[PDB]
Structure formats: C-alpha cells, structure tokens
Design an enzyme around this catalytic site. Structure first.
Site, PDB file in Angstrom:
ATOM      1  N   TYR A   1      -0.501   4.180 -11.574  1.00 56.93           N
ATOM      2  CA  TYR A   1       0.755   3.902 -11.971  1.00 56.93           C
ATOM      3  C   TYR A   1       0.998   2.405 -12.577  1.00 56.93           C
ATOM      4  O   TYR A   1       0.034   1.894 -11.827  1.00 56.93           O
ATOM      5  CB  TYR A   1       2.081   3.795 -11.017  1.00 56.93           C
ATOM      6  CG  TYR A   1       1.581   2.762  -9.310  1.00 56.93           C
ATOM      7  CD1 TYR A   1       0.013   2.798  -8.852  1.00 56.93           C
ATOM      8  CD2 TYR A   1       2.100   1.649  -9.302  1.00 56.93           C
ATOM      9  CE1 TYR A   1      -0.386   2.034  -7.776  1.00 56.93           C
ATOM     10  CE2 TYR A   1       1.194   0.359  -8.571  1.00 56.93           C
ATOM     11  CZ  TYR A   1       0.342   0.388  -7.953  1.00 56.93           C
ATOM     12  OH  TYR A   1      -0.338  -0.396  -6.773  1.00 56.93           O
TER      13      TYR A   1
ATOM     14  N   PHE B   1       5.503  -5.770 -12.725  1.00 57.39           N
ATOM     15  CA  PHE B   1       4.896  -5.915 -11.392  1.00 57.39           C
ATOM     16  C   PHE B   1       3.442  -5.724 -10.849  1.00 57.39           C
ATOM     17  O   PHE B   1       2.840  -6.647  -9.502  1.00 57.39           O
ATOM     18  CB  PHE B   1       6.043  -6.285  -9.893  1.00 57.39           C
ATOM     19  CG  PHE B   1       6.094  -4.811  -9.468  1.00 57.39           C
ATOM     20  CD1 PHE B   1       6.906  -3.841 -10.268  1.00 57.39           C
ATOM     21  CD2 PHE B   1       5.223  -4.217  -8.663  1.00 57.39           C
ATOM     22  CE1 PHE B   1       8.323  -3.060  -9.609  1.00 57.39           C
ATOM     23  CE2 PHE B   1       6.200  -2.896  -7.583  1.00 57.39           C
ATOM     24  CZ  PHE B   1       7.159  -2.923  -8.499  1.00 57.39           C
ATOM     25  N   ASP B   2       3.531  -4.863 -10.998  1.00 54.87           N
ATOM     26  CA  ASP B   2       2.558  -3.808 -10.784  1.00 54.87           C
ATOM     27  C   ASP B   2       2.000  -2.776 -11.692  1.00 54.87           C
ATOM     28  O   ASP B   2       2.688  -2.535 -12.668  1.00 54.87           O
ATOM     29  CB  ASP B   2       2.120  -2.985  -9.556  1.00 54.87           C
ATOM     30  CG  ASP B   2       1.072  -3.709  -8.055  1.00 54.87           C
ATOM     31  OD1 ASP B   2       0.083  -3.245  -8.836  1.00 54.87           O
ATOM     32  OD2 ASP B   2       0.570  -2.541  -7.331  1.00 54.87           O
TER      33      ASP B   2
ATOM     34  N   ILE C   1       6.668   3.679   0.102  1.00 50.50           N
ATOM     35  CA  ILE C   1       8.468   3.565   0.086  1.00 50.50           C
ATOM     36  C   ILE C   1       8.599   5.067  -0.101  1.00 50.50           C
ATOM     37  O   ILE C   1       7.872   6.368  -0.481  1.00 50.50           O
ATOM     38  CB  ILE C   1       9.203   3.234  -1.300  1.00 50.50           C
ATOM     39  CG1 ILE C   1       8.382   2.814  -2.690  1.00 50.50           C
ATOM     40  CG2 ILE C   1       8.107   1.475  -0.888  1.00 50.50           C
ATOM     41  CD1 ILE C   1       8.966   2.026  -3.882  1.00 50.50           C
TER      42      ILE C   1
ATOM     43  N   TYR D   1      12.517  -0.836  -1.176  1.00 44.98           N
ATOM     44  CA  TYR D   1      12.635  -2.353  -0.106  1.00 44.98           C
ATOM     45  C   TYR D   1      13.080  -2.401   0.275  1.00 44.98           C
ATOM     46  O   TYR D   1      13.555  -3.595   1.125  1.00 44.98           O
ATOM     47  CB  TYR D   1      11.263  -3.256  -0.874  1.00 44.98           C
ATOM     48  CG  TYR D   1      10.258  -2.588  -0.717  1.00 44.98           C
ATOM     49  CD1 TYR D   1       9.350  -2.212   0.314  1.00 44.98           C
ATOM     50  CD2 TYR D   1       9.583  -1.832  -1.887  1.00 44.98           C
ATOM     51  CE1 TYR D   1       7.931  -2.512  -0.183  1.00 44.98           C
ATOM     52  CE2 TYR D   1       8.275  -1.787  -2.072  1.00 44.98           C
ATOM     53  CZ  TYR D   1       7.443  -1.757  -1.572  1.00 44.98           C
ATOM     54  OH  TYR D   1       5.938  -1.271  -1.901  1.00 44.98           O
TER      55      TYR D   1
ATOM     56  N   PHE E   1       8.793   3.280 -11.790  1.00 47.37           N
ATOM     57  CA  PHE E   1       7.167   3.569 -12.153  1.00 47.37           C
ATOM     58  C   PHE E   1       7.329   4.578 -12.881  1.00 47.37           C
ATOM     59  O   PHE E   1       7.551   5.570 -13.454  1.00 47.37           O
ATOM     60  CB  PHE E   1       6.967   4.141 -11.013  1.00 47.37           C
ATOM     61  CG  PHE E   1       7.119   3.246 -10.162  1.00 47.37           C
ATOM     62  CD1 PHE E   1       8.358   2.791  -9.056  1.00 47.37           C
ATOM     63  CD2 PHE E   1       5.852   2.267  -9.448  1.00 47.37           C
ATOM     64  CE1 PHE E   1       7.883   2.650  -7.795  1.00 47.37           C
ATOM     65  CE2 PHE E   1       5.539   1.437  -8.425  1.00 47.37           C
ATOM     66  CZ  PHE E   1       6.447   1.338  -7.686  1.00 47.37           C
TER      67      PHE E   1
HETATM   68  C1  LIG Z   1      -0.439  -0.557  -3.446  1.00 43.81           C
HETATM   69  C2  LIG Z   1       0.600  -1.009  -3.374  1.00 43.81           C
HETATM   70  C3  LIG Z   1       1.651  -0.072  -3.258  1.00 43.81           C
HETATM   71  C4  LIG Z   1       2.589   0.662  -4.537  1.00 43.81           C
HETATM   72  C5  LIG Z   1       1.882   1.484  -5.123  1.00 43.81           C
HETATM   73  C6  LIG Z   1       2.817   2.739  -4.127  1.00 43.81           C
HETATM   74  C7  LIG Z   1       4.150   2.627  -3.529  1.00 43.81           C
HETATM   75  C8  LIG Z   1       4.503   0.955  -3.333  1.00 43.81           C
HETATM   76  C9  LIG Z   1       4.171   1.184  -1.823  1.00 43.81           C
HETATM   77  O1  LIG Z   1       4.999   2.059  -1.299  1.00 43.81           O
HETATM   78  N1  LIG Z   1       3.110   0.116  -1.162  1.00 43.81           N
HETATM   79  C10 LIG Z   1       3.455   0.625   0.401  1.00 43.81           C
HETATM   80  C11 LIG Z   1       3.827   0.292   0.676  1.00 43.81           C
HETATM   81  N2  LIG Z   1       4.559   0.704   1.969  1.00 43.81           N
HETATM   82  O2  LIG Z   1       5.044  -0.408   1.016  1.00 43.81           O
HETATM   83  C12 LIG Z   1       2.000  -0.234   0.534  1.00 43.81           C
HETATM   84  C13 LIG Z   1       1.320  -1.357  -0.789  1.00 43.81           C
HETATM   85  C14 LIG Z   1       3.151  -1.287  -1.419  1.00 43.81           C
HETATM   86  N3  LIG Z   1       4.122  -0.320  -3.651  1.00 43.81           N
HETATM   87  S1  LIG Z   1       4.196  -0.884  -5.108  1.00 43.81           S
HETATM   88  O3  LIG Z   1       4.167  -0.743  -6.094  1.00 43.81           O
HETATM   89  O4  LIG Z   1       6.255  -0.700  -5.356  1.00 43.81           O
HETATM   90  C15 LIG Z   1       4.934  -3.165  -4.482  1.00 43.81           C
HETATM   91  C16 LIG Z   1       3.656  -3.411  -5.519  1.00 43.81           C
HETATM   92  C17 LIG Z   1       2.867  -4.793  -4.964  1.00 43.81           C
HETATM   93 CL1  LIG Z   1       2.083  -5.738  -5.829  1.00 43.81          CL
HETATM   94  C18 LIG Z   1       3.329  -5.231  -3.825  1.00 43.81           C
HETATM   95  C19 LIG Z   1       4.731  -4.737  -3.125  1.00 43.81           C
HETATM   96 CL2  LIG Z   1       5.558  -5.209  -1.791  1.00 43.81          CL
HETATM   97  C20 LIG Z   1       4.974  -3.351  -3.531  1.00 43.81           C
END
Ligand SMILES: C=C[C@@H]1[C@H]2CCC[C@@H](C(=O)N3[C@H](C(N)=O)CC[C@@H]13)N2S(=O)(=O)c1cc(Cl)cc(Cl)c1
Length: 127
Positions: free
Chosen positions: A45, A55-56, A75, A101, A118
């Site tokens: 992704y 951002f990622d 999420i 979030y 995404f």
């Molecule tokens: C490895 C990261 C993933 C990524 C990829 C999946 C979607 C989302 C996510 O559900 N996450 C989990 C969570 N329960 O929060 C664990 C951490 C975070 N993010 S995200 O891309 O939205 C994301 C990226 C980054 Cl750099 C920071 C955050 Cl807080 C979230």
C-alpha cells in the site's frame, strides 16, 4: 488526482451506506474469491493525507504489511476494504475519519479528523 477521483467516483462499500469508505477497483484480481475472516493477508500500500502528502508506503520498506483480516488489527476501513478484494487486485480507498483514526488522530503522522487515501494491492491471503 486519484484522491479526488475516488472521492467523486468511488463506490460506497460500507454496510451502513454512510459513504465512510469509498472504493475504485484499479486492477481486477483473480477469480471471485475474497479472503475470509481470520485469514493472513499480505498487502502492499501507499497512503496519502488530504494535504497531498504521502505519509506511508510498504513498497518503500521492500516488504508487505501482513495482518489477520477482520480482527480489528487495522483501522475499520481496512478490515472492510481488504475483505472486498480479490488476490492480485489493486484498489483505491477513500476513508472518512470515522473509519480511520477519528478525532484522536495518531501522532505524529495522522492529524485529527483526517480523511485518508490508500492505494492497496492484495498480494495473497491464507488461512
Ligand atoms: C504499519 C502500519 C499500519 C498502516 C497500514 C494498515 C492501515 C493502518 C493501520 O491500521 N495500522 C494499524 C493500526 N491498528 O492502527 C497498525 C499500524 C498501522 N496504517 S496507516 O497506513 O493508516 C498508518 C501509517 C503510519 Cl506511518 C502511521 C499510522 Cl498511525 C497509521
């Protein structure tokens, strides 16, 4: 760009039909089967914020993100969204904060009340 397009042209994939998660299929995947709850899913992704910033990216880490589908490990929009995907599919998701979030955000990178974009590729899924 792609975020605007999924905002304006995507399909609502929420059960509530509240437009909280919109999707466009960019590349059609294989057959008809989508993963099931508890499957180990392998994805790649890229995420962007509404300020236009990436951002990622898992691509930039040279390895996929792996999680168990439908267990709240991600999420809400990701559980909902990846559940709609076939192996090999590439999709765009446009996610309102209620399926991400929320008002809390997630410091440092995710502000309060953030709509997320995404591009997601489902590489594989396994029980
Ligand atoms: C490895 C990261 C993933 C990524 C990829 C999946 C979607 C989302 C996510 O559900 N996450 C989990 C969570 N329960 O929060 C664990 C951490 C975070 N993010 S995200 O891309 O939205 C994301 C990226 C980054 Cl750099 C920071 C955050 Cl807080 C979230």
């Amino acid at each position: 760009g792609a975020p605007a397009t999924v905002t304006e042209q995507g399909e609502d994939i929420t059960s509530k039909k509240d437009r909280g998660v919109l999707k466009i299929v960019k590349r059609v995947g294989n057959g008809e089967e989508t993963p099931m709850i508890g499957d180990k899913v392998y994805v790649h992704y890229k995420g962007k914020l509404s300020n236009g910033k990436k951002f990622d990216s898992s691509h930039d880490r040279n390895e996929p993100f792996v999680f168990s589908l439908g267990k709240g490990q991600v999420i809400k929009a990701w559980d909902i969204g990846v559940a709609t995907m076939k192996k090999g599919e590439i999709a765009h998701l446009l996610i309102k904060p209620e399926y991400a979030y929320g008002s809390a955000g997630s410091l440092p990178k995710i502000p309060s009340n953030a709509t997320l974009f995404f591009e997601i590729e489902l590489l594989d899924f396994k029980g």
